[PDB]
Design a protein around this nucleic acid. Structure first.
Ligand code: MN
Ligand code: MN
Ligand code: MN
Ligand code: MN
Ligand code: NA
Length: 326
DNA sequence: CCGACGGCGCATCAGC
DNA sequence: GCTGATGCGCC
DNA sequence: GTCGG
């Protein structure tokens, strides 16, 4: 909150570039600068001081100077007043509507929540569910509720097969007091990098969570990644809990450390870490860390038996999950 | 100046 | 049906 | 939009 006005401004600029401009590198650049400013431990007094930080350049420094002088940014004040930009930015808040679909919808005169609700026939399945729960998905999840959700998922998973291990990742594993959604890493010794010794491993778990009415909707589903909706049960006469997003990712059991590093995030931390790996001659994905050859082609997977091993390869001191909230 | 910017799963579509 | 391009999503 | 080469 120390430089919250500036990081809010940069986040709004990032969203504009992603949703309206469709300028994905500008989006990433703005989020990177907002993240580096968010952890900077001083109240920023000038654009020059901010430009010292890596990721903040000349253009952001000038916007920081304007924002500290006036409390606002004329560029954003004008974007806020533009009906098409404002409409597009709103529509992209529905899950499954991206910058392309939002511009298409605005083109056909579908521009509000009410318009969406009467044009449900114009939405794909993902978008219809995103619209159905629009308000619920805007709410954060208190850690106490994440603990209740963890208990259900971990206990239901054990009832399918005691050899499953489910791990809640995301901001929850980084120790946050609130989470945007619930991200669950799933393993089972039958599914490794060397063989899938049993089918339906993810299906069986999804079906079980549907059976006890935890999972209520599905946005997308494949053999390794489920994206859906869930909901805590409420006690007698209690108001219902909000519907929540849930992501489940089944990772080969022998590649758990790369998988949990990936799924713990944060997303900017991952981008920073994988970019630094490239600079050190490695490429990291959710499965493996591999060397890069003279030709820049990826080599064979390096041995890994801890999250820390991955940090070593790229010459980073180990950072606990709680210090990866970039 | 210029090229690179993290890496990948699932849904939808056009072309064959 | 398949493949590759694209869109949207995940951290 | 920013950065290293
Ligand atoms: Mn999450
Ligand atoms: Mn998620
Ligand atoms: Mn609801
Ligand atoms: Mn670079
Ligand atoms: Na969206």
């Amino acid at each position: 909150t120390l430089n919250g006005g500036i990081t809010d401004m940069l986040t709004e600029l990032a969203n504009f570039e992603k949703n309206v401009s469709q300028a994905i590198h500008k989006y990433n650049a703005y989020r990177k600068a907002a993240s580096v400013i968010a952890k900077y431990p001083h109240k920023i007094k000038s654009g020059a001081e901010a430009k010292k930080l890596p990721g903040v350049g000349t253009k952001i420094a000038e916007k920081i100077d304007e924002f500290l002088a006036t409390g606002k940014l004329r560029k954003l004040e004008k974007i806020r007043q533009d009906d098409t930009s404002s409409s597009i930015n709103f529509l992209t808040r529905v899950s499954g509507i991206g910058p392309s679909a939002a511009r298409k919808f605005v083109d056909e005169g579908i521009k509000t929540l009410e318009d969406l609700r009467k044009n449900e026939d114009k939405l794909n399945h993902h978008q219809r569910i995103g619209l159905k729960y629009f308000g619920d998905f805007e709410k954060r999840i208190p850690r106490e509720e994440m603990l209740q959700m963890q208990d259900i998922v971990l206990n239901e998973v054990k009832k399918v097969d005691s050899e499953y291990i489910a791990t809640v990742c995301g901001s929850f594993r980084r120790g946050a007091e609130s989470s945007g959604d619930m991200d669950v890493l799933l393993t089972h010794p039958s599914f490794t990098s060397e063989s899938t010794k049993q089918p339906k491993l993810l299906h069986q778990v999804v079906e079980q969570l549907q059976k006890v009415h935890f999972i209520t909707d599905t946005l997308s589903k494949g053999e390794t990644k489920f994206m859906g909706v869930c909901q805590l049960p409420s006690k007698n006469d209690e108001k219902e809990y909000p519907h929540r997003r849930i992501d489940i990712r089944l990772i080969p059991k022998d590649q758990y450390y790369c998988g949990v590093l990936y799924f713990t995030g944060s997303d900017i931390f991952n981008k920073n870490m994988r970019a630094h790996a490239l600079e050190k001659g490695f490429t990291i994905n959710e499965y493996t860390i591999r060397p890069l050859g003279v030709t820049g082609v990826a080599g064979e997977p390096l041995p890994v038996d801890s999250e820390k091993d991955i940090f070593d390869y790229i010459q980073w001191k180990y950072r606990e999950p709680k210090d990866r909230s970039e």
